[PDB]
Amino acid sequence: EVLLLPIDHQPANVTTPTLDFTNELTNWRARVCELMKNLVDNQRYQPGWTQSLVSSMRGTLGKLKLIKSMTPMYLQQLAPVELAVIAPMLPFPPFQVP
Amino acid sequence: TQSLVSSMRGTLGKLKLIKSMTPMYLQQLAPVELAVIAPMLPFPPFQVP
């Protein structure tokens, strides 16, 4: 009676869900965006570009960090609950290595 | 002007980092292929240093 998961989960405290960012996959998306922002300001790299391209690329990365989507909150709150609901009524029982 | 020197630096910095196998070939496989071919030539090789 235990099911191992790749990611971290937490129980949803409320039942009217709403957008938040304290979230492991949101942290992951933010760190990838911060790496690419640190990539596009380099003395070996930015003189290869124009100025408007630097400005537009930094704007696009700053908006991809702050794009809203309930999917990481879904994966950390609701998806393991319904996987645990589905998993008994199943013709092939779960088979996991750690 | 501006935005010409920048694109020139980008073109040069990319053309340095182009991925071509020809300098690898000329030092690893072209000498052993010349050494393979060279005895079976009707005009055998004639070299000054």
From TrEMBL, chain B:
<comment type="function">
    <text>Inner capsid protein that self-assembles to form an icosahedral capsid with a T=2 symmetry, which consists of 120 copies of VP2, with channels at each of its five-fold vertices. This capsid constitutes the innermost concentric layer of the viral mature particle.</text>
</comment>
<protein>
    <submittedName>
        <fullName>Lambda-1 protein</fullName>
    </submittedName>
</protein>
